[PDB]
């Protein structure tokens, strides 16, 4: 292909259907699993 430059995209664009008497309620759900890695020690010199 090639090499290009450009201006980053922060993210999509969501438009919430807000009104003064409307609510959204979930009817289902999922269980999700994520990881987090943290360093605790270093080498003793």
């Amino acid at each position: 292909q090639s090499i290009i430059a450009y201006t980053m995209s922060l993210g999509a664009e969501n438009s919430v259907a807000y009104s003064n008497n409307s609510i959204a309620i979930p009817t289902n759900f999922t269980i999700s699993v994520t990881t987090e890695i943290l360093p605790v020690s270093m080498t003793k010199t």
Partner: peptide
């Protein structure tokens, strides 16, 4: 600028930061 000293620009402009803040405000 000085004798070998330079200041680098930030990656995010302050317009882009304003767009993160307005998204947090509109979501909330």
């Amino acid at each position: 600028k000085f004798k070998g000293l330079t200041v680098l620009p930030p990656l995010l402009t302050d317009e882009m930061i304003a767009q993160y803040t307005s998204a947090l405000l509109a979501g909330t």
